[PDB]
Amino acid sequence: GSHSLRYFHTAVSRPGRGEPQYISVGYVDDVQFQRCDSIEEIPRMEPRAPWMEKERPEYWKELKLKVKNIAQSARANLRTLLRYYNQSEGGSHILQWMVSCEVGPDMRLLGAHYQAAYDGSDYITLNEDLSSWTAVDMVSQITKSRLESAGTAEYFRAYVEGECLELLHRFLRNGKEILQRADPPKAHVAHHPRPKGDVTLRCWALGFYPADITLTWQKDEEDLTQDMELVETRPSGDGTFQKWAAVVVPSGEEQRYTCYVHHEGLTEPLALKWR
């Protein structure tokens, strides 16, 4: 449907030896296309998707300069955050932020995002209008007041409507075979007797893309929300994803349970019973 370019940035004050002071990974939808980091001030960049082989050398040369400047600015921000929060020196603190832009099926821009967190908690978020900010406390309220006085959201918008749109368009073009697809799940039910006479029914979904999915068990006349065990959707490592959901049921009543699967690649929810 719609397509998104996303970057996930992390800065660490006094990381461990050999660990990055700054790292960012970039995605189109659920496909990673690069890793950037800075260790002891040295920037490094690595491609991760096949379409990145088509980028010209200047792409990587400009990216390296961006990495150096971002890593120095994040380090400075972490130092000021320590002061405004009256925190002791020596400890290690974390600054994370996300950056994205989204286009619809016709490449029209639909939205964009900028949001930051400090030590794993929300700090500041850019609103849907792309012009105002939401803070969480009096420190982040200083940031908001400064960013609004200086009209900083204008330059984020220029980035969104400039490089973010440029890159999203070119990546989708060169990587169309990977990105413009929807692989539906392959589903089946597994049956495992338990030593007490009852039975585990495990509903599997494999090989689907994108990752968003839903699995649900249902009984004749009883809701199973609280009864069923779900695992977090997980990468198979080849581009696809997998998941399962399980319930314990008495032996002999297996055929009154049904597993429902919902996914983008399915025009209707799939239904499954044991055997």
């Binding site: 970057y7 940035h9 960012s24 970039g26 950037c36 990216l63 961006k66 990495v67 400047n69 971002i70 600015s73 994040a74 400075a76 921000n77 000021t80 955050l81 405004y84 600054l95 932020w97 950056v99 900028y114 930051a116 700090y123 500041i124 420190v139 200083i142 940031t143 400064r146 960013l147 900083t152 984020f156 980035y159 490089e163």
Partner: peptide, 7 residues
């Protein structure tokens, strides 16, 4: 690949 100065 964009960063905003917090403080």
């Amino acid at each position: 690949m964009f960063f905003i100065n917090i403080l």
